[PDB]
Paper text:
Previous studies have established that BceAB mediates resistance against bacitracin, likely by freeing bacitracin from the lipid target undecaprenyl-pyrophosphate (UPP).
Residual signal subtraction focused on the TM region was followed with a round of 3D classification without alignment, generating two distinct classes of particles with high-resolution features in the TM region. Refinement of these two classes independently produced separate 3D volumes each at ~3.4 Å overall resolution. We refer to these two reconstructions as TM-state-1 and TM-state-2. For simplicity we focus on TM state-1 for the following analysis. Within the detergent belt 14 total TM helices were clearly identified, with 10 belonging to BceB and another 4 belonging to the BceS dimer. The cryo-EM maps were of sufficient quality to build atomic models of TM1 and TM2 of each BceS monomer de novo. In the middle of the bilayer plane is a cluster of aromatic residues including Trp12, Phe16, Phe49, and Phe52 that form an extensive π-stacking interaction network.
Author numbering:
A (entry chain A): 1 to 183, 195 to 646
B (entry chain D), D (entry chain E): 1 to 334
C (entry chain B), E (entry chain C): 3 to 246
The structure:
């Protein structure tokens, strides 16, 4: 009857059930259009860092299209398997196989292309807000202008047309194959599988706690440990759902006797049998959630890392190594109404033996312990400490170094001079820096010696491992003032860019990690929405599968105000377990290696976890509103 | 209604707050828009929104209170006058339901009144052949057969009169006619009416009327006297019934006393009950027990009090206290 | 306990009205085993429905244990009908994901009876119906003659006032039917529980003490039995059916 | 219903639009906030507002349309399930008023039942006197006066029986009792009932019944036969009435023929009308014209067909067409 | 109508093969209500597939009303089943976006027939089934039994000759199942159309007149009712199934 009317009614019915699908499609099209418009913007080159700036957006776009193209293809194969009782009926009524295809592939192209056409119109309104968000994290005061950038339209249209062709191919393959006309007790294996899964997860957690502690110290021995940790955790997570929930469910069940209330009857019938059926999807969700949270948290810590480490890398506000350039810069500062405080200090490069002061293992070489390059400075130059003869004090913190190189209390240090050796003892480790990073190799600390000892050590001055400049010419600045014009003066001093400045090595790091945060945050948002929609589309089937149970339960006196109160806990257990496993994974991943980027945790991690939990909880709250409708019509 | 008002309008305050947050965010993320001015304007608009919400609540939460006080009370005018379109529909629904109720009730009452009128017409059509039978039969020669037939005819006529007065007791108030009534001719007529029963039962009558005139309605008072005399004759055998009327105080009192079986003291309070019958004898089963109830109910609009004094095995005394002359002036005024 | 005063029910779709209850009045004292039977298009099923709270009333009043049910709102009616009025259905109505010890103990979970006395009560009930050996067997593993004794045991634990049985022995063979009826009679005798049964089987009604022959929504005589043999009452009921 | 929604919630849109206008106007003048970067804010807010209005229209303007659909036509259940508190109050008030209407209907039914009970009470209280009068009358010695009294008594009894059958024909369907009836004893009983009128008018009956068995309701068939015989006797003077029953094919029939005045052909088709009276004779005023209607109406469920062949000055023929035996098997079995 | 002669179904996936059908001989006549009962593991679903000729037959000769099922092609087979056969399934298959009238008239709307005859057929069928009052409602707002009755009414509109039927009692309680079986029995007598139920419930098969018990193949061991009273026949069915 009136095939047009049938198609229209089916379209209006589909628009009511799958509205989250339409929302996800519109949001994905909006983000893709926004990124492609932003990539070709000529104002994107104001971002300067190691990453070019217009070659990271090109990577983000390609990474996003895969996340969208997997969700679309999985949703469109969940959908079609709920239209089989209609396909068989249409085949036995008398219709062919090339008319059902046209009936059910003309009620879907309308929805798809309407959502696509709406998404492009709402992807032009927010194209400038993305620019303005980017030009606030990586500090830039350029101007953003609203435009269309036609180049993005072609790309979006081509991409989504290709995805639609894939969907049509998959539907046509399904129709011709599954067409025809045809409309417990626990075992010993499950116990072993559950125990194995839990043991594997615990072992994977334990091994990661060592890594950069004392052992595995070889540039290739680490990779084996990392591969073992990842493989063990993934396999344990996969086996946690097949067998390790049935075991605990059996314990909880045969730990009650026979007294079960309505909530437990509704609960211990889904997650004993249906959580097992979904093992390859929940595993993916948990691992990718953990990855996103960990990466975002580390990228956030890298900010305060940048600030403090860039303050530490150059001791003074500026660093110089050529006397002519330094004198020219100070003359230029003189007439600029800027009074500079200048103080220089010579440094001695020598090797000493400190093998006896590490309390760890000999495997921590990083060079010969008896030939380590250290820096020696006088005691009159330092205005804070006044050591005595036969005494030495260390300098620098380098939170990485303490965790990797453990320093004992007072020991013995042998001065490896040409023909003499004066032993000293370790007094203590200081907290401030005194010399730039270039002289002290990577991050090796520096020692403090007495003026009397210096008076002879500088006289010795073995010229075998000395560098070009044994001095720390570096100009400070006056009290808090306008440092920007001083930076401009310094920039025009060095056309060869051979000197370093305090507030230019503290900007490349900010730009790089701000770009990283931007990309990871947007990809995490997209994956969050995708996983929420996919997990919401299964509770529909799980609900019309449990409809008979509600019917029988309502002839024994139970009312809707009790069935819904029991469903509100099943819908908590079905949505909370992957979240908790992902949170544990993230916590035990971040803590293992947080001392490689920054120097502070528990600040960003909590906030990222709370935001993720809030959005996931919205997507979880939206399903009781469907369970209520199912229960209402089962009298 | 504050909680109800803020649970019905929970979808507009959220929109307002989201709009404010969007404005603040877009102002924050730009360098060309000062933040402080936007903060000040957000604050001022929040306060003005509070005041606006107060006014709109006070204006809007009235008609529903009016309809909720309409549903369970005794005033149809509890609903206030609707002002916004979303109230006129509810008003129309209520008006339509009330109109349907009134129309159905009026039609049903009219139909039942017509049925009652047809029923009393049939009562008249039944009572007429009784008069025809009386006219045909008032030519007898045998004394005993004539006495028996007249007794039965008088019983049937009394039953028909009782039924007619039962029908008319619902509108006696529309039948009241206040005028002075000569007691002696009325009592003589009542005695002549019940002559056959006294002849068969050997019942005598003595008339002692100190008071000759009373103020009441002729027809209903005559019916009450006839009912009392019929009950006295039926409940008495071969005894003299004493009818006395005397003026006590400012009211006229009529006393009807017989020397019959009397009334049981346990049954004295229940003689005026509707449908009451004596349980001692099976001869009283055929008695309707409704004449006394009709007489007592019809006596109230006549301002006549019925007093009864009975002794078991000795006799029954019925007293009728006529009203004061000035007590009917208020009735005539209305 | 039960007392109805001139009940009346009219089944109509707002266009055609056909009354099926025409002034039924019944009188049941505490602790008797009565039955209702007669005809096939009569209102006996609707009579059983209206006596309980599963269906409403048009004209009449019904009293249970002194309390009145006609003038009650759905919340109070549901609460009262949960707290009393055990039900035995025609079909099993058993959940297939629980055991026998949990199906007949789930309804008793909204009264907070701890665990030990609940287990003791379950043992008491299951030792009389002979199902104590099936505490851990799922319903899809026992014969059809025991999945009805399970329902009866479920309906007997909370000690209700009146137990409404609607053709229990409808889909069983003679042996299981006789065994179930004997167990029901013993349960009635031990603890005083009123049982109202609707049946088409004269053998099923033989075990009762009183019988009511609803005919076109009327009374049409009423037997009383008393100190009489089961067989003789059976031929008496057979003769009464032959008359009707 | 766009206009109703816009007018009803007309004071909420003004607040948002006022805020936008104020922000634009202030940003116009102040030389610290750019004007090119605030139209963007206004634009985003406008889209959000429009989408919110469109999504809020359809969730609100539903119940007030369902009420209008419910208003007059049909489908008492058409009202949707309320969601907001105001909808709940409206629905509860409407349901309460409908329940009050149902209670009023129940009170009307109770009043009707009480009236029927009182009518039956009067019916028996009237039927006892006729039996008493018959018992007393069956002792007379005189001829002419006894004949007149019997005439009047039979007239009263026949009228009362007609009224009783008219009252009972509302529930006759629950009183039907069909069995084999012997025509001759029933006709003899009806003639003995009409003995007085037949003797006074000198009318005999010629009984020649070829068919002696009928299948119908004995009581109502006897009533119909008595009414037909009474009408034939009344409309005839000093004439013989012929009664013949014959087997016409598979159907039984009974004939009543009189040699009276007959009925005018212009009035013959209307004889069975309710209350139809012939104005040719002044004597027809006493005739109620309702016995024939009752006879025909009672013949309808019994499958009895009445054919009339009346000629003025010759007589009237009344024929009862009894049905076939097997036609009662669809009535007894179902 | 049809005849069964050595009805066998072939198999042979990978290496393991089963002989589910081992030769079937069935003789039935017009105006019958034959039921094919049995036990699990006998391939009753495969029996329906072979009997309905949905799957390609392997061996045996079957003549549906004088026409062999091996004498026509795939399109010819489809036309034959759509023009001569009707189906009723266990789970009702009714579109939720149609009405109770369009659902019934859908099979007859793909045949190019005038509106008057379709309206007459719908009126007579819905009047004889009792769903005519619900002529324009949706299957989302009707009870459980009315949906199955509509599904049964779909297959009775195009004047078939054999009405195949899977278990029409799977998702119905006692009252709905009894009403549906009574309606089917009434419809069988009016117009000649054979009904072949395949159920595992003695209550649903007690309304029949010819029961066949299949354990692994050709077994017969059949009852024939004749003049029973629907109760003795029920007990006989239960007894003869319990023996096996
Ligand atoms: C899976 C995780 C889900 C998280 C989803 C959050 C939204 C998606 C985000 C993209 C940007 C995420 C940025 C993370 C936090 C950035 C912190 C930050 O930038 O700090 C400061 C604040 O900067 C910002 O907040 C930039 C604005 C991003 C806020 C969150 C974005 C909300 C996105 C919703 C609106 C976007 C429209 C499109 C999506 C609906 C900047 O530094 P400063 O205060 O100027 O001081 C300079 C120091 N000398
Ligand atoms: C980066 C920024 C990009 C901009 C993002 C824009 C995307 C949001 C836009 C448009 C929403 C389109 C999706 C919903 C439209 C389809 C739903 C629909 O119209 O169905 C209508 C009713 O809709 C509904 O049932 C639910 C209404 C809720 C509105 C949709 C909610 C939007 C999505 C909420 C999801 C929240 C997740 C957010 C997570 C970050 C018709 O149904 P009916 O039963 O026939 O009632 C008729 C009334 N008498
Ligand atoms: C992040 C920039 C946002 C730009 C404006 C937002 C665009 C429109 C967004 C959604 C509008 C509201 C959609 C859902 C309304 C729900 C209505 C309801 O609660 O019944
Ligand atoms: C940061 C925003 C968080 C909250 C976002 C909520 C968006 C709207 C929520 C309601 C949408 C669905 C409500 C209707 C559902 C239904 O009718 O079935």
């Amino acid at each position: 009857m009136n095939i047009n009317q049938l198609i229209l009614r089916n379209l209006k019915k589909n628009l009511r059930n799958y509205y989250l699908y339409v929302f996800a499609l519109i949001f994905s099209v909006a983000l893709y259009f926004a990124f492609v418009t932003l990539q070709y913007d000529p104002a994107i080159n104001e971002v300067k860092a190691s990453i070019k700036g217009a070659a990271a957006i090109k990577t983000a776009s390609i990474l996003l299209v895969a996340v969208v193209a997997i969700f679309i293809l999985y949703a469109n194969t969940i959908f079609i398997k709920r239209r089989s009782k209609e396909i068989g009926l249409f085949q036995l009524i008398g219709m062919t196989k090339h008319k059902i295809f046209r009936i059910l592939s003309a009620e879907n192209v309308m929805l798809y292309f309407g959502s696509l056409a709406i998404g492009v119109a709402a992807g032009f309104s927010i194209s400038k807000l993305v620019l303005m968000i980017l030009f606030k994290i990586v500090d830039v005061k350029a101007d953003a202008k609203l435009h269309f950038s036609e180049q993005a339209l072609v790309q979006t249209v081509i991409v989504f047309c290709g995805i639609y062709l894939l969907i049509m191919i998959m539907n046509y393959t399904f129709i011709k194959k599954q067409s025809i006309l045809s409309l417990k007790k626990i075992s010993f294996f499950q116990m072993l599988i559950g125990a194995l899964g839990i043991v594997l997860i615990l072992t994977g957690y334990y091994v990661s706690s060592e890594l950069f502690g004392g052992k595995f110290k070889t540039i290739n021995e680490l990779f084996v440990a990392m591969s073992f940790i990842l493989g063990s955790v993934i396999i344990g997570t996969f086996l946690f759902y097949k067998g390790s929930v049935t075991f605990i469910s059996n314990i909880i069940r045969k730990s009650k006797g026979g007294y079960l209330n309505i909530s437990e009857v509704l609960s211990l019938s889904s997650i004993m049998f249906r959580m097992k059926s979904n093992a390859l999807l929940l595993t993916i969700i948990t691992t990718v959630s953990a990855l996103a949270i960990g990466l975002l948290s580390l990228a956030y810590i890298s900010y305060y890392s940048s600030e403090k480490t860039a303050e530490q890398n150059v001791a003074a506000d500026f660093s110089f190594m050529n006397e002519k350039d330094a004198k020219l810069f100070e003359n230029k500062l003189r007439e600029s109404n800027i009074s500079f405080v200048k103080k220089a200090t010579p440094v001695l490069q020598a090797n000493v033996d400190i093998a006896n002061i590490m309390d760890g293992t000999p495997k921590e070489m990083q060079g010969d312990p008896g030939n380590m390059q250290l820096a020696v400075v006088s005691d009159k130059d330092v205005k804070g400490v006044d050591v005595a003869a036969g005494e030495a004090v260390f300098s620098g913190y380098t939170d990485l170094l303490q965790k990797i190189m453990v320093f004992k209390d007072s020991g013995v240090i042998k001065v490896k001079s040409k023909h003499e050796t004066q032993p000293l003892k370790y007094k203590g480790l200081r907290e401030e820096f005194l010399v730039s990073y270039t002289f002290t190799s990577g991050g090796m600390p520096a020692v403090i010696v007495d003026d009397s000892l210096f008076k002879q050590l500088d006289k010795d001055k073995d010229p075998r491992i000395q560098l070009a400049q044994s001095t720390f010419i570096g100009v400070n600045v006056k009290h808090d003032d306008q440092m920007e014009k001083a930076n401009e003066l310094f920039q025009q001093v060095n056309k060869k860019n051979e000197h370093l400045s305090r507030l230019d090595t503290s900007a490349a790091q900010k730009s790089l990690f701000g770009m990283v945060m931007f990309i990871v945050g947007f990809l995490g948002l997209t994956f969050l929405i995708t996983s929420g929609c996919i997990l919401y589309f299964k509770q529909m089937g799980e609900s019309e599968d449990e409809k008979p149970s509600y019917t029988i339960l309502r002839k024994l006196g139970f009312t809707q105000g009790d069935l819904i109160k029991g469903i509100r806990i099943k819908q908590m257990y079905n949505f909370g377990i992957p979240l908790v496993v992902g949170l544990f994974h993230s916590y035990f991943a971040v803590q293992s290696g947080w001392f490689l980027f920054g120097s502070e945790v528990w600040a960003p991690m909590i906030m990222v976890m709370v935001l993720y939990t809030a959005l996931y909880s919205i997507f979880g709250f939206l399903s009781v509103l469907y369970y209520k409708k199912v229960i209402k019509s089962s009298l | 209604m504050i909680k109800a008002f803020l649970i019905e309008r929970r979808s507009w305050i959220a929109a307002f707050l989201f709009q404010q947050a969007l404005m603040l965010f877009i102002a924050f993320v730009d360098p060309s828009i000062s933040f402080g001015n936007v903060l000040y304007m957000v604050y001022l608009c929040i306060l003005f929104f509070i005041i606006f919400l107060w006014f709109r609540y006070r204006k809007e939460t009235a008609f529903y209170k009016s309809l909720k006080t309409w549903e369970n009370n005794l005033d149809v005018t509890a609903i206030n006058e609707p002002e916004t379109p979303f109230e006129a529909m509810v008003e129309r629904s209520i008006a339509g339901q009330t109109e349907h109720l009134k129309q159905t009730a009026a039609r049903h009452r009219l139909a039942l009144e017509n049925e009652k009128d047809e029923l009393m017409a049939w009562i008249h059509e039944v009572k007429t052949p009784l008069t025809a039978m009386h006219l045909i039969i008032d030519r007898m020669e045998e004394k005993a057969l004539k006495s028996q037939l007249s007794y039965e005819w008088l019983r049937i006529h009394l039953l028909l009169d009782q039924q007619l007065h039962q029908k008319r007791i619902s509108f006696i108030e529309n039948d009241l006619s206040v005028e002075f009534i000569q007691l002696q001719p009325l009592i003589f007529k009542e005695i002549k009416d019940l002559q056959s029963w006294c002849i068969q039962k050997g019942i005598g009558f003595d008339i002692q009327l100190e008071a000759k005139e009373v103020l009441s309605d002729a027809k209903w008072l005559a019916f009450i006297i006839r009912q009392l005399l019929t009950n006295a004759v039926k409940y008495s055998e071969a005894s003299e019934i004493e009818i006395k009327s005397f003026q006590k105080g400012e009211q006229t009192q009529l006393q009807v006393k017989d020397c019959g079986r009397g009334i049981d003291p346990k049954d004295v309070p229940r003689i005026f009950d509707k449908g009451f019958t004596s349980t001692t004898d099976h001869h009283d089963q055929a008695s309707t027990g409704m004449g006394l109830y009709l007489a007592k109910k019809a006596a109230a609009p006549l301002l006549i009090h019925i007093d009864v004094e009975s002794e078991f095995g000795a006799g029954t005394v019925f007293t009728l206290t006529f009203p004061i002359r000035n007590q009917f002036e208020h009735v005539i005024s209305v | 306990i039960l007392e109805a005063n001139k009940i009346r029910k009219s089944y109509g779709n707002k266009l055609n009205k056909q009354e099926v209850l025409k002034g039924i009045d019944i009188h049941i004292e505490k602790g008797e085993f009565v039955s209702i039977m007669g005809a096939s298009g009569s209102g006996k099923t609707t009579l059983l429905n209206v006596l309980s709270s599963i269906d409403q009333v048009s004209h009449g009043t019904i009293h249970i244990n002194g309390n009145d049910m006609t003038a009650m709102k759905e919340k109070q009616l549901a609460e009262f009908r949960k707290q009393h009025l055990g039900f035995i259905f025609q079909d099993y109505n058993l959940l297939d994901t629980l055991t026998v010890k949990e199906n007949i103990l789930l309804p008793l979970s909204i009264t907070k009876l701890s665990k030990k006395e609940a287990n003791r009560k379950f043992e008491e009930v299951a030792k009389e119906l002979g199902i104590y050996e099936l505490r851990d067997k799922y319903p899809n593993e026992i014969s059809g003659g025991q999945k009805q004794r399970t329902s009866a045991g479920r309906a007997f634990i909370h000690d209700p006032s009146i137990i409404f049985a609607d053709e229990p022995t409808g889909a069983l063979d003679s042996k299981s039917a006789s065994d179930l009826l004997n167990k029901l009679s013993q349960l009635n005798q031990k603890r005083n529980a009123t049982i109202i049964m609707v049946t088409h089987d004269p053998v099923a009604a033989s075990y009762c003490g009183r019988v009511i022959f609803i005919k076109d929504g009327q009374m049409y005589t009423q037997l009383n039995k008393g100190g009489q043999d089961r067989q003789t009452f059976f031929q008496d009921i057979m003769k009464t059916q032959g008359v009707l």
